Amino acid sequence: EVQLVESGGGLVQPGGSLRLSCAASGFNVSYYSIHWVRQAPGKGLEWVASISPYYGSTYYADSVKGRFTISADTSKNTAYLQMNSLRAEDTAVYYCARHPYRKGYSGLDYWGQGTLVTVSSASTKGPSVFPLAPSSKSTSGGTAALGCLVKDYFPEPVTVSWNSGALTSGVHTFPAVLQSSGLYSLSSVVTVPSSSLGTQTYICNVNHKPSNTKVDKKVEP
Amino acid sequence: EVQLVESGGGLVQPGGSLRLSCAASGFNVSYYSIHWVRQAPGKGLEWVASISPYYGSTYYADSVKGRFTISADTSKNTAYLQMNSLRAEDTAVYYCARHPYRKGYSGLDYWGQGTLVTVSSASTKGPSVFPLAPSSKSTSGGTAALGCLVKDYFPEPVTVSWNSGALTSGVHTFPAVLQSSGLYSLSSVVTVPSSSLGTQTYICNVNHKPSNTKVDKKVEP
Amino acid sequence: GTLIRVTPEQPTHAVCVLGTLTQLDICSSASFSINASPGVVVDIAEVTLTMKAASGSTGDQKVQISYKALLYLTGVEISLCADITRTGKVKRTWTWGPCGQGAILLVNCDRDNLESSAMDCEDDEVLDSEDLQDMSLMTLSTKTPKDFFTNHTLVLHVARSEMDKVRVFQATRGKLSSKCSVVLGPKWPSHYLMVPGGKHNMDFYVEALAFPDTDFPGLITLTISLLDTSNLELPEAVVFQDSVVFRVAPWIMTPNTQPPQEVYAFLKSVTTLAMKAKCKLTIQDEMEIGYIQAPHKTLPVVFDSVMGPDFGYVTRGLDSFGNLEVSPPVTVRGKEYPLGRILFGDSCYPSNDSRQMHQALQDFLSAQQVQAPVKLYSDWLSVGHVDEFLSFVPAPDRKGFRLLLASPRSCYKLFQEQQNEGHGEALKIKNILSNKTLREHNSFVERCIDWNRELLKRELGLAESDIIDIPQLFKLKEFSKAEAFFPNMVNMLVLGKHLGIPKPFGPVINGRCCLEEKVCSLLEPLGLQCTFINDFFGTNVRRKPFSFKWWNMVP
Amino acid sequence: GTLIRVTPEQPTHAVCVLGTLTQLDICSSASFSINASPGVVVDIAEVTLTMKAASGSTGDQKVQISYKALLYLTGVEISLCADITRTGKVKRTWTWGPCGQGAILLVNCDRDNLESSAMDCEDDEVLDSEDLQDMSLMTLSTKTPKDFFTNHTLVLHVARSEMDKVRVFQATRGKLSSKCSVVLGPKWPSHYLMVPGGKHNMDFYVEALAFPDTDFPGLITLTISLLDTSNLELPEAVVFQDSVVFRVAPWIMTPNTQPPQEVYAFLKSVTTLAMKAKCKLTIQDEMEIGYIQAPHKTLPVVFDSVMGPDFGYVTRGLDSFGNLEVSPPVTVRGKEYPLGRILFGDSCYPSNDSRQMHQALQDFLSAQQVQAPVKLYSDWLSVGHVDEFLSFVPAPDRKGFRLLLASPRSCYKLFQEQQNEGHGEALKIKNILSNKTLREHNSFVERCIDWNRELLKRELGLAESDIIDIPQLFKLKEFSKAEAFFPNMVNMLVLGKHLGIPKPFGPVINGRCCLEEKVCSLLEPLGLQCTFINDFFGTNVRRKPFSFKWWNMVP
Amino acid sequence: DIQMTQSPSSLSASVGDRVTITCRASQSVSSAVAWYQQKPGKAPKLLIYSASSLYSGVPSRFSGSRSGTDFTLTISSLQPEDFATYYCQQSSYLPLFTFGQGTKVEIKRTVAAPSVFIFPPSDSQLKSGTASVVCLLNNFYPREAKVQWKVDNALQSGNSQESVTEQDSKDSTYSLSSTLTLSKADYEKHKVYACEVTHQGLSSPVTKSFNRGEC
Amino acid sequence: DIQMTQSPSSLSASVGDRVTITCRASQSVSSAVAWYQQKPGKAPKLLIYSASSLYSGVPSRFSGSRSGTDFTLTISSLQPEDFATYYCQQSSYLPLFTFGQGTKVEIKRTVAAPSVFIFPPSDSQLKSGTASVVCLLNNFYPREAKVQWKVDNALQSGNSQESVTEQDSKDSTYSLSSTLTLSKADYEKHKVYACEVTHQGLSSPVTKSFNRGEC
Ligand SMILES: [Ca+2]
Ligand SMILES: [Ca+2]
Ligand SMILES: [Ca+2]
Ligand SMILES: [Ca+2]
Ligand SMILES: [Ca+2]
Ligand SMILES: [Ca+2]
Ligand SMILES: [Ca+2]
Ligand SMILES: [Ca+2]
């Protein structure tokens, strides 16, 4: 069977460099064209570059011409992509895909799992959690909204649960939004019968593994 | 008027090197072929080498091919001959001559004065003078022969006179002969009335300037 | 051509390309009959198969053999055009003359994008639709079944040995530019093309990257390979090839007999001449301005021993361009030279102190056989330049031109006639005619120019009546080389029928210089207008390209 | 030609060389009459002067002009021969064919003096009279007044750009060697000659120092200048020139259809073949043995991708000489190739991992236009060599030869016929016919060899009846390149009509191998004697040079 | 460099319906197109490798077409597994590809009014020098909503972020989080805070508000 | 490499006579020859620059000729200034010249018997370990002479040197010096020393002798 496995991802500084690799199994890369496709968070697909080791040609998208270099090793059955002068706009998941041009079609059949490349000056930093206590300002009908803010953290992801997973009903955890500061901020909220306030436990558990930070925050009036 | 003046001569060791030069006046050497001709002591003329600065060609005799190199400088109006790996057989006077090939003839019109090149392991050494006293063994008719040997000297020349030049009649000084030792030996003799023996002065004056040696030797029974 | 296997062992299949005649292998496996389906034509001489039109499906037609055996046929159209007849937009090897064939390239040596100082052929991009007018267009025409390319592929390539002489671009949007990518070039000699099924036409733009030279004959060949890809674990086989041959247009020089277009530049006299000649006068060193021509466009090119939108620049390089000139068109012992011959000066035989034009320039000019070179004797001059004794002007009669030589004999005859009429005191004539050293220096020069008179009339097909002897004296310097005695009246500025001649300051009789009256009496009868310029001695003149097309010559 | 001044101002004098027509300048200084003395002939068309014989004194003949003026004439004979008609000892430019003209040189690439390992053209000396048989002789013939050379000199020279391609020796003692000195060579392009007055003949020996290549067209020109030296303080002028043009003989290869001469070398079978073929068998790597030919001598030459008295050596260099072969003489669409064509293998289109013969070898072989090259497809083989599938043998009938190809189709047909007759157990035939992987590997090879069948019959002017299909199977290796399944029966040793064929070890029926019986049934009807050699796979064979002279071809 | 536009940017249907996605090229590409499907957290999967023709292993529900420069994907009998983001790929001669903007296919349901909540900044955040005012829009449909911040009648711009959840797997609604980010000083300057919400499901605009310091 | 022989090696005449010098080449050189004259201590002077033709400034007494490969110089009315060594020069195409052996022209006179003298080694030389025995041949004509050393009837070879003077300007005779070089030990070994002289002018051989130690 055919498999593509990407590696070489991680976090880098603006103006720096990074090399990606993708190991092939089930076929010999010398008989296929290899493509890289970029997808920024919340955006669509952007074609980056292609190489055809059988002919030795390379092509690049206008957005990376003069910075990116693509290459391949037919003895290691592996493709490479060398990045230089990276900017914040280059943050995205990079996919490696096979193009079997010998079959007469232009579509890309086998794709890898993708590797995330992040370009930022932000340091590793634990979240600051702030309770959103329930009150008459969050009450509607027979229920009340409450939650936690998990602000000023880096890098992604943060995993949030309530009562250590005991409370999942009515719980909505939002995707985080990148702030202009370079840190991420998310909210996590739950809607509960108001008859439960002050009796039911509402502790949010925020886990940010990159900084070994665990915050247990009780939310109450 | 046309003149050729040779220089660069002297005494060298076997296996060594020496460069000759010849300065031209009255003509521009770039329009003539320049020849070198060798004459060993007591021998005839041997052609050595030629150069034609207008065409850049050089030619050498079989006896010097691979050792001798000929060249010329058209800005200094001077010809050169570079010798290498010299042997005792290369001892001779070297003449420089002009060949006006533009006039249609092969003969050499203007010649220089010549410069002596000597190849020998012999050191500078003063003569040992030995009288040849007159006796009944050198008497014939009314006269007697007497003389001096001037043996084991180097280099040439030695000038010999009798009674400081007062006695020149009947005096014969011979050219010197090179000995297998590397030194020269000559004889100088005079024939005198035998009636003069023991009364007339017979002192030979041997002058060998290279060693600052002057020998006044009285020849008598 | 291509052999097709036919056998009773099992049914077979083959692809035939329209215009190609193929052979059927029937006698190798079993007196027989051939039953061909509609649209299939088979002749016997030895069995030759051909098809009338491309198929819409795999195995559309078949041929049955009865002695039984069965062969299936698929017809396709695959061809590459590239302007083979030399007219443009036309839609074997390269040949010369009005009855020949073969495509032509221009070297992309101009600068159409004004945002950069680089030459257009130095990069791997087409940055503007104007640069496409300097490139040769070729169309790849195909017609196949909709599913044909699932077992086949097409590869375009250039021979490895010439991959740095040509670059081929993808014509996205056809006649328009859309930041075209590279198909072939110095970074790789071959590439596959994703050709879909059905009837399609793809355009390519081909440019030359270099001029002809010692190691480059001028021909470039582009070939398309059709490969059989039907077995994915088995190496690909070639089943059909087709190709076109291009020649790179050579650099051509313009002589003094071609009508002028513009002058780059005393200026009061040049402006007066530019106005009478109806030329554009504008504001560099001396350079030779020529051109390269192809059926679709003509481009001016500068030769340097500076670039503009359609103003080309080429180098390929101690004697400067005063030593390189061109004759008018000639016929030499029955052979025609529609573009003339290229004249340059050197030594009559090499020596240890002689001069000659550098071999790289002789090889570059000789590598472009449309204008044959001629060797002239110029090493006798202090500067060694042809323009010091030889120049050309137009003429309305038999030949169409005159060859002008410096003549010490014409000046001495003119001075002796003035002396005979009693003008020996004019400035003096008596002091020039009595100077034995000056006469002997000119006697050497007379034999030198007369040697060139023989070389010029032998190589250029001329008569003595085609040559004018203009009075000019010479003296030898401290290094024995010739220099002009008085301002050179042969090395003039020619703008059609108007001549910008350096002014002499010789003897004057009745208000006119004797040298100016003699020159006028030789040139004005031809319709040429003579003006004498004070202190004549960075001027360049561009002439109109030849009306004759260089690819119709047979070198 | 050369212009002579005539004037009433003072008497003049000129030198005329026999065979040259000169012009008289009469109308420039003063309707006139010409009075020529005996032996002087003058025609009017424009006054042309010629002389019947050389003078014994200065000013021997004169011409009087009456309108008065007086011209003195001295006649001389100056000419250089150099074997212009191509027959030897004969006593304009170079041209091709039986109706052309021009001299020929050999490259002095043998080793006639056995006291040194150096090549004869590498030094500046002729050490033996035998080395003179490898050099082209030219005679300088002169006749002048006894005092003529007191005001004149002759200079022999070669163009500076080709001075390292030729060396010219002084022929002291004529046909004999006497340690000859150098007149021209790599150390200087020109030299003066001390020619005496009266009737004389001087001999020169001219040798080539290099073979034709990308930067060397093969032509060398030697010119003699006559200079006027009459004024010793005035620079010398040229008054007459004459020259001869040589071409350097190209390297020519011998195909399998040329009669053999000697074999360098299992040996029991080679000795048996050498005896039946009447050849010399003696005791190196694989090299291609060819020759160079001139009207005066033919020399064998070895081409290396070793020297003897008349056994030449040339280099000019990852595919070895198993990939370089030669066809017999052919006619291609009306064009004749009297010496055949040179065949070498490479890739069908270049890629990032393909193979080809190094460009220096393609340029060297293409630079010698007497045997045109052909490109064949061989990169599909594990070694990439032409000799693996293609070979030639003699034939007595129409064509004079046969083209032999490997054919997997011929072997599978032979095995299926044995299987149909009940021999499937022979070693097995049933295990080969049932192997689907082996059949698919051979299907790829069938298309590869069939592509070469088309290239060979298109470029060599052949019919299908001129080609024999010899049974041979192939398998693909771990790198997907083709290798032989059983010993190669096409890559055989050819000595006239006797064939040294590698022995197969395939299925045997009634005491004979089926592969040997099939090969015999294809080759023995042509008169060819087949012997099968055990363990066939440093052997070289020298063939007789062509009877056709290469300078009579028109490339 | 041929450009393309893909539309509609958002599609909706129930299970069993028929939907189409289209894209327009500015110039013809001679049928050189492909179609892909993507689910959150997965690499794109190839459906169509050339105009019309379906990739091996894809359900028969998918088929493509061309009319001039307009290309279409048709999905018949739409199944729960077909609700994903789709992309149009434009290709040509040589390996250089261009992607469209992409289109999301979501699940059709009855319009639902959002539940609007507001929270003041807590003391723990205010003590650090920052303040966030939170406005929640819980459980509404469709996804598009208009939320504005109006503090003491002064409309804010540039300091309000939004995040929206994926469509709920149980009731097909969306939740939207709207947060107003202020410094401690900019917060103290003002008294009356309000989050005004307009949505298709509200018969009239709904605003929640609070006064700083009054809790 | 064409070789040549010049002869006679010695010529003699009185003032006013006619003499010729010849040289043979092994192969023809198409008249490429020259003639030179040399006096002791001077460079060679050019007389003839090609076969026959005379160099400017040379007296009319000199002229050359050729017959096949044999070249000749003729000197008419021979003057005192013409008595010198002459050389034949062979030349060809290119500047490569070959010279002959050379010939000396001397003055003719009546044959004169040599005066023969012998000297024993002096004590001053013997004390240093060497000994020279001197034999003089004074004032004889012609130049050629036969001188041999015979010590105790044992003829010597290899240890005898000879030197000959130039022709005397006053009486045209020659003097010859013959010296026998011995070590002190080789001298003591022998008793009777003799110098034997044979010459055209001696009616009988003349020998001078001495006995070691008897003075
Ligand atoms: Ca460009
Ligand atoms: Ca351009
Ligand atoms: Ca342009
Ligand atoms: Ca010019
Ligand atoms: Ca040699
Ligand atoms: Ca030889
Ligand atoms: Ca030989
Ligand atoms: Ca071979």
What CATH number should be reported for the domain holding residue D401?
Answer: 3.75.10.10
D513 part of a folded domain: yes
In DSSP terms, which residues pair with C4 in a beta bridge? Answer: C24
Report cis status (omega within 30 of 0) of the bond before F142. Answer: yes
**Quick check: D199 contacting F, CB < 8 Å?**
no
User: Minimal Cα distance from D479: which residue of A?
Assistant: A28
Contact by Cβ (8 Å): C113, C131: yes
Burial tier of E203 (Cβ tally within 10 Å: 0-12, 13-18, 19+): exposed
**Quick check: D117 contacting C, CB < 8 Å?**
no
Our measurement of the distance from residue A158's CA atom to the centroid of its chain's CA atoms, rounded to an integer in Å, reads: 11
Rounded distance from Cα C131 to ligand 1 centre (Å):
8
Q: Which of C388, C452, C448, C429 has its CA nearest to residue C513? A: C429
Contact by Cβ (8 Å): B60, D179: no
- What CATH number did the domain enclosing C92 receive? 2.60.40.1700
Query: Which architecture characterizes domain F4-107 according to CATH?
Result: Sandwich (2.60)
Number of H helices, E strands in chain F: 2, 18
Tell me the torsion sign for CA atoms D105, D110, D112, D117. positive
Task: Show which of residues 287-306 on chain D sit within 8 Å of chain C, judged by CB atoms.
Answer: none
Q: Where are the domains of chain E?
A: 4-107, 115-211
Least CB-CB distance to E46: which of A109, A131, A186? Answer: A109
Instruction: Test E32 with C196 for CB contact under 8 angstroms.
Output: yes
Least CB-CB distance to E44: which of A45, A105, A151? Answer: A45
**Quick check: E215 contacting A, CB < 8 Å?**
yes
Query: Which spans in D225-376 are helix H?
Result: 267-276, 359-366
Q: Annotation-wise, does D131 bind a ligand?
A: yes
**Token couple for C248:** 């790179």
d(C-alpha C104, C-alpha C248), whole Å: 6
Rounded distance from Cα B104 to ligand 7 centre (Å):
37
Tell me the torsion sign for CA atoms C138, C141, C146, C151. negative
The whole-angstrom distance between C202's CA and the closest CA on chain E is: 9
Which of the listed residues D248, D275, D309 is the one where a domain comes to its end?
D248
Q: Name the DSSP letter for residue C520.
A: H
Token pair 């298109």 is found at D458
Our measurement of the distance from residue D484's CA atom to the centroid of its chain's CA atoms, rounded to an integer in Å, reads: 36
d(C-alpha B88, C-alpha B121), whole Å: 9
Chain A residues within 8 A of D352 when measuring between CB atoms? 53-56
Our measurement of the distance from residue D450's CA atom to the centroid of its chain's CA atoms, rounded to an integer in Å, reads: 32
Distances (CA, A) of F91 to C9, C128, C327, D1, F7: 90, 75, 48, 36, 18
The whole-angstrom distance between C224's CA and the closest CA on chain E is: 14
**Token couple for C194:** 């994703």
Residues D7 and D136 in one domain: no
d(C-alpha F64, C-alpha C506), whole Å: 57
d(C-alpha D251, C-alpha D373), whole Å: 13
DSSP string, D147-171: TGGGSEEEEEEE-GGGTTSEEEEE-
**Quick check: B62 contacting D, CB < 8 Å?**
yes
Task: Give the method used.
Answer: cryo-EM
Which CATH number does the domain A3-119 belong to among 2.40.240.10, 2.10.109.10, 3.90.1200.10, 2.60.40.10? 2.60.40.10
Least CB-CB distance to F177: which of B59, B99, B174? Answer: B174
D555 part of a folded domain: no
**Token couple for D322:** 């198993």
**Token couple for D250:** 């190209």
Specify the pairing of strand F10-13 against strand F103-107: parallel
Task: Show which of residues 155-194 on chain C sit within 8 Å of chain D, judged by CB atoms.
Answer: 155, 157, 159-161, 163, 188-190
d(C-alpha A138, C-alpha A187), whole Å: 15
Contact by Cβ (8 Å): D182, D169: yes
- Non-local (6+) Cβ contacts of D362 within 8 A are C161, D344, D373
In DSSP terms, which residues pair with D169 in a beta bridge? Answer: D182, D205
d(C-alpha C281, C-alpha B193), whole Å: 112
Query: Which spans in B33-157 are helix H?
Result: none
Q: Name the DSSP letter for residue D423.
A: -
Q: Which of E63, C169, C203, E89 has its CA nearest to residue A105? A: E89
HEC string of D198-237 equals: EEEEEEEEEEECCCCECCECCEEEEEEEEEECCCCCCCCE
d(C-alpha D108, C-alpha D310), whole Å: 10
d(C-alpha D145, C-alpha D78), whole Å: 12
Residues at the binding site of C are 108, 110, 112, 120, 123, 125, 131, 134, 284, 286, 288, 304-305, 310, 321, 324-325
Burial tier of C43 (Cβ tally within 10 Å: 0-12, 13-18, 19+): exposed
Contact by Cβ (8 Å): B51, B57: yes
The four Cα atoms B4, B8, B11, B13 give a dihedral, to 10 degrees, of -130
d(C-alpha D431, C-alpha D426), whole Å: 10
In DSSP terms, which residues pair with A35 in a beta bridge? Answer: A50, A97
d(C-alpha D204, C-alpha D272), whole Å: 49
- Three-state SS at F51: coil
Specify the pairing of strand D252-253 against strand D288-294: antiparallel
Indicate the number of domains in chain C: 3
**Token couple for C422:** 């009693």
**Token couple for B206:** 């041997």
Give the number of other CB atoms < 10 A from CB of residue D466. Answer: 17
Contact by Cβ (8 Å): C22, C2: yes
Residues at the binding site of C for Ca(2+) are 108, 110, 112, 120, 123, 125, 131, 134, 284, 286, 288, 304-305, 310, 321, 324-325
Resolution in Å, one decimal place: 3.5
d(C-alpha F122, C-alpha B134), whole Å: 11
Angle between helices D408-420 and D436-459 (to 10 degrees): 130
**Token couple for B190:** 């005079």
- How many degrees, rounded to 5, is the angle at CA F171 between CA F166 and CA F174? 35
Q: What's the distance, Cα to Cα, between the start and end of chain D in Å?
A: 34
HEC string of C103-169 equals: EEECECCCCCCCCCCCCCCCCCCCCCCCHHHHCEEEEEEEEECCCHHHCEEEEEEECHHHCCCEEEE
Which of the listed residues C198, C228, C248 is the one where a domain comes to its end?
C248
DSSP string, D30-87: ---EEEEPTTEEEEE--EEEEESS--SSTT-EEEEEE--EEEEEEEEEEEE-S-TTSS
Q: Which of A52, A62, A103 to mutate to test the interface with C (most CBs of C within 10 A)?
A: A103
Angle between helices C514-523 and C408-420 (to 10 degrees): 120
Contact by Cβ (8 Å): C232, E131: no
- Three-state SS at F184: helix
d(C-alpha B196, C-alpha B163), whole Å: 14
Our measurement of the distance from residue A146's CA atom to the centroid of its chain's CA atoms, rounded to an integer in Å, reads: 27
In DSSP terms, which residues pair with D48 in a beta bridge? Answer: D23, D43
**Quick check: C183 contacting E, CB < 8 Å?**
yes
Instruction: Test F93 with D193 for CB contact under 8 angstroms.
Output: yes
CATH 2.60.40.10 fits E115-211, yes or no: yes
d(C-alpha E5, C-alpha E102), whole Å: 9
- What is the CATH number assigned to the segment(s) A128-218? 2.60.40.10
Q: Which amino acid is at C303?
A: F
In DSSP terms, which residues pair with E89 in a beta bridge? Answer: E34, E99
Specify the pairing of strand D103-105 against strand D237-248: parallel
Residues C30 and C88 in one domain: no
Helix (H) or strand (E) holding E133: strand E130-140
Q: Which of E177, E182, E212 to mutate to test the interface with A (most CBs of A within 10 A)?
A: E177
Instruction: Test B55 with C353 for CB contact under 8 angstroms.
Output: no
Token pair 């077992």 is found at C151
D3-11 contact pairs (CB < 8 A, 24+): D3/C450, D3/C453, D3/C454, D4/D49, D4/D71, D5/C409, D5/C446, D6/D65, D6/D69, D6/D71, D7/D69, D8/D68, D8/D69, D11/D70, D11/D71, D11/D72
Contact by Cβ (8 Å): A110, A98: yes
d(C-alpha D529, C-alpha D499), whole Å: 6
Task: Show which of residues 96-125 on chain F sit within 8 Å of chain B, judged by CB atoms.
Answer: 96-102, 115-120, 122, 124-125
What is the radius of gyration, based on Cα positions, of chain C?
32
d(C-alpha C176, C-alpha C262), whole Å: 32
Rounded distance from Cα A54 to ligand 5 centre (Å):
51
The 10 Å CB-count burial string (b at 16+, else e) for D437-454 is: ebeebbebbbbbbbbbbe
Token pair 């009496």 is found at C521
**Token couple for D230:** 């009459």
Q: Which of C347, C348, C353 to mutate to test the interface with B (most CBs of B within 10 A)?
A: C353
D475 part of a folded domain: yes
Instruction: Test D194 with F32 for CB contact under 8 angstroms.
Output: yes
Tell me the torsion sign for CA atoms F138, F141, F144, F150. negative
Instruction: Test D172 with F92 for CB contact under 8 angstroms.
Output: yes
In DSSP terms, which residues pair with C242 in a beta bridge? Answer: C224
Which of the listed residues C231, C248, C265 is the one where a domain comes to its end?
C248
Contact by Cβ (8 Å): A132, A148: yes
Catalogue the active-site residues of D: 285, 385, 387
User: Minimal Cα distance from F27: which residue of D?
Assistant: D173
Q: What's the distance, Cα to Cα, between the start and end of chain C in Å?
A: 34
Instruction: Test F36 with B45 for CB contact under 8 angstroms.
Output: yes
Instruction: Test C173 with E32 for CB contact under 8 angstroms.
Output: no
The whole-angstrom distance between B49's CA and the closest CA on chain D is: 13
Q: Annotation-wise, does D110 bind a ligand?
A: yes
DSSP string, C372-409: -EEEEE-TTBSS--GGGTEEEEE-SSTTSEEEEEEEHH
Contact by Cβ (8 Å): C187, C124: yes
d(C-alpha D338, C-alpha D258), whole Å: 12
Contact by Cβ (8 Å): D322, D383: yes
Contact by Cβ (8 Å): D393, D402: yes
D419 part of a folded domain: yes
Burial tier of B26 (Cβ tally within 10 Å: 0-12, 13-18, 19+): exposed
Specify the pairing of strand C312-314 against strand C297-303: parallel
d(C-alpha C156, C-alpha A31), whole Å: 17
DSSP-based helix, strand, coil % in chain C, nearest 5: 15, 35, 45
Chain A residues within 8 A of C190 when measuring between CB atoms? 55
Chain C residues within 8 A of E29 when measuring between CB atoms? none
Q: What is the largest CA-CA distance in chain E?
A: 69
Q: Name the DSSP letter for residue A182.
A: S
Q: Which residues span the domain enclosing C256?
A: 252-552
Q: Please list the residue range(s) of chain A that carry CATH number 2.60.40.10.
A: 3-119, 128-218
d(C-alpha E38, C-alpha C205), whole Å: 38
Residues D306 and D448 in one domain: yes
User: Minimal Cα distance from D236: which residue of B?
Assistant: B102
Token pair 């064409």 is found at F2
Residues D64 and D95 in one domain: no
Q: Which of C470, C491, C482, C480 has its CA nearest to residue C533? A: C491
Tell me the torsion sign for CA atoms B100, B105, B106, B108. negative
